Design a protein around this ligand. Sequence first.
Ligand code: HEM
Ligand code: HEM
Lengths: 137, 137
Amino acid sequence: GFKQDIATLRGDLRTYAQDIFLAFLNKYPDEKRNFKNYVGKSDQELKSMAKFGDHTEKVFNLMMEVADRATDCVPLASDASTLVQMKQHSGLTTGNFEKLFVALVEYMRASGQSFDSQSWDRFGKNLVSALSSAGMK
Amino acid sequence: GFKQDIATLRGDLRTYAQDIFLAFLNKYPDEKRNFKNYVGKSDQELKSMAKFGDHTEKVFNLMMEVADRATDCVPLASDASTLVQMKQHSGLTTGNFEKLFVALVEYMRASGQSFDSQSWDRFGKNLVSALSSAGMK
Ligand code: HEM
Ligand code: HEM
């Protein structure tokens, strides 16, 4: 289930983080514009870029902690507040996070591994809800 | 405390894993003989190899899972058994693990962060005991 999935992703986190974030950027090409120097690059070029590798690893390290601290796929309010107050996320909305979780769930369903994709769908919706209550537009 | 330390380390797992492993190898150069692929290389050469980062991240992820499952810094006997039965740990003794934790605690005390270095010292001692009880020489 959900708890074992966190363990599965952590076991190969660098690979999963890059694969899932690329799936997001390719499913929603407009989301590349939030990032500098991502446009015009294929996936293998992105994986060679320092800031891509560093950001995606930090995204997923923290996301797995938020998932780990949730109860029944509902995140702690404090984790939602933490994500809203990050200075780097100045011009983000919940829609950016919504789209990331649609791509993540789609990646899990296509993967052939036994992820609990329904729980991740719930987790993504509940995190978006928490982000809005914490102050994200 | 200890539980926050796990969250700090997991937040930047690949970076901490490499720096701590290098601190171990450089404090105890005899231990590098166990890692034939890493002999003859400086710190920056090792950090530039993908296989070094990949290995240290996987190892450190498992160490954090063991630490997370411990009670009062006492690891589960089942986790100690997993570590003893791993094929890559054939020929290791509890002395190798003791040296790892001396270097870990030294690294935490020098880092200038608010790690609970005393709890990690206790966890290392209790892990060494559990490894003996699970069959390690
Ligand atoms: C979901 C969990 C996320 C976490 C934990 C997270 C975390 C971080 C962190 C630690 C940084 C470091 C600042 C830096 O050096 O760039 C950062 C920057 C950044 N993040 Fe995120 N982020 C998340 C989601 C997103 C999403 C969905 C977007 C969508 C656009 C995004 C866009 C950015 C951007 C644009 C930067 C600044 C780098 C740049 O200007 O290209 N993040 N984020
Ligand atoms: C709590 C402490 C430790 C944990 C959780 C741990 C875990 C692991 C894991 C998961 C692997 C396989 C990694 C991979 O697939 O690349 C591994 C390999 C290995 N470990 Fe450990 N280990 C620990 C302590 C040690 C110590 C103290 C030593 C020696 C001083 C050691 C020596 C080795 C060696 C030689 C390998 C083979 C690496 C290779 O050939 O690629 N381990 N360990």
